[PDB]
Ligand SMILES: *[C@@H](O)C(=O)N(c1cncc(Cl)c1)c1cccc(-c2cccc(Cl)c2)c1
């Protein structure tokens with residue numbers, strides 16, 4: 066038992082992290098087969114970043130302008146191109162540590178592990194959710210650009226996130242690995258801001274099920290509620306609407322705990338209207354919304370990866 | 372910016388995880404050079420576990436009674452011995468993925484990353500603190516025995532924890548890698564229980580500094596307090612005493628934020644007496660105590676490992 070914010074083992078991703086330097090800018094790249102992926106703003110100066118014409122900036126670059134360091138081994142760049150907001154640096158060596166991988170784009174509400182790196186060296190791993198407003202509440206300092214977010218499904222790494230920038234509220238914006246930003250953000254220095262967030266309702270419910278599985282039951286009650294009546298309450302507290310598909314996704318957790326989804330919704334309703342009254346749930350005094358139903362099942366059942 | 376419960380990259384440890392089977396019991400082992408370390412209760416039946424004579428149980432075992440699987444490769448056991456509560460299985464192959472390592476025993480209040488595994492396969496990684504009562508609030512299901520806890524210092528893995536068992540409150544007890552239990556726990560089935568815990572005061576203060584570094588300041592005030600007067604309050608709220616060494620350890624954080632340690636103590640005092648009044652700190656409605664001053668500096672400054 067127990068419930069933790071658990072990231073995937075990061076080894077398979079660690080073997081892909083490289084250092085990409087262009088001019089005075091150093092950040093992280095992702096080395097898969099003979100390509101290194103990195104944020105295209107690596108080719109920018111500070112003055113460039115205020116109105117960058119990246120096509121202009123890149124045509125003025127040569128392969129030798131890109132220093133790629135894989136550990137203490139320099140990778141010779143033999144080709145470069147832009148794909149949306151990422152650079153693809155073709156290198157003369159295929160990464161022998163390339164895992165089976167996919168580039169997948171995730172949905173707000175889904176979670177992933179972030180391997181934070183600096184200078185191509187992994188620093189830490191932690192679990193993130195894609196907020197409804199397409200930001201992530203990460204932990205990133207200068208030089209973390211190019212750190213990737215990922216999930217692991219058996220032996221296959223699904224890369225979903227590459228870190229590009231921090232927004233003024235301290236949240237983080239980035240792209241999928243095809244270079245397409247999550248949310249309405251651009252890789253230049255504008256006054257862009259996150260935009261209002263909501264709480265991921267289906268995740269809160271999943272975590273309430275995790276709590277029940279782990280012996281926290283004080284928030285249960287005999288009441289039930291209809292989906293519509295719950296969603297009236299969700300709207301009032303800035304929770305996103307619960308759909309029948311969410312209810313279906315919560316079925317397994319419902320069946321394992323014996324608590325009907327709508328019954329758990331009634332419990333969430335009371336938690337929203339009454340607060341927690343000095344009590345905690347799974348060591349939290351807040352309703353946690355960064356565990357998906359899959360995360361709960363994985364952790365409260367015990368799936369591994371090889 | 373941002374602050375997350377961050378574990379160390381787990382790759383170096385993943386390459387050491389193996390599956391140890393003895394009879395019908397399967398758990399995880401740690402394969403370093405030509406030794407596999409695992410909980411000695413692997414040699415137990417259920418009936419054995421109620422009054423085990425492990426010396427008796429082990430003398431009745433042979434090398435061939437231990438099936439060690441490193442991935443899809445079977446490691447031939449050529450020797451076995453007990454060291455306290457761990458088994459040392461000598462295998463005919465040195466682990467080519469052996470990192471530089473040390474076996475270190477940690478102090479309550481210190482943190483570490485846990486690589487949760489099942490059947491020798493890494494499942495997830497998360498950050499744990501050694502509670503003052505020598506338990507850890509982990510996430511472990513049946514079959515996680517032998518998962519290890521560790522820290523990484525540049526390129527060297529300091530193994531500090533091997534998981535043995537779950538206590539009746541759902542917290543976890545284990546040994547250091549020399550087989551010596553953390554806390555007053557034994558690897559048999561008794562009525563052992565965790566014993567009362569306290570909150571790790573120096574860690575809470577460190578996290579308050581992390582909050583200030585990350586822009587949460589609402590809990591600051593102009594008041595100060597003496598160490599003695601703070602400790603009178605710490606005692607009342609089941610916080611452990613703050614020492615001058617803690618104050619010294621907090622010096623760097625104090626200097627970076629400009630908030631005197633004793634001033635932050637006055638803030639903690641008010642947080643304890645008044646609660647948080649509907650506000651949060653670093654996304655928590657509770658005072659977080661599983662970040663050490665080192666964890667905060669590492670994350671709020673950006674140290675990596677290679
Ligand atoms: C990489 O340079 C980097 O990691 N930056 C960073 C990312 N996340 C958090 C923090 Cl605190 C820093 C970084 C540093 C300077 C500028 C930028 C940046 C500004 C505007 C647009 C983009 Cl794509 C990047 C990012």
Ligand SMILES: *[C@@H](O)C(=O)N(c1cncc(Cl)c1)c1cccc(-c2cccc(Cl)c2)c1
Nearest residue numbers: 066511512513514515516535536537558559
């Ligand atoms: C390994 O068997 C295992 O991982 N066990 C376990 C550990 N942590 C949490 C949970 Cl839910 C299970 C496990 C399973 C059965 C028995 C024991 C056990 C009982 C008494 C003493 C010891 Cl050392 C172990 C542990």
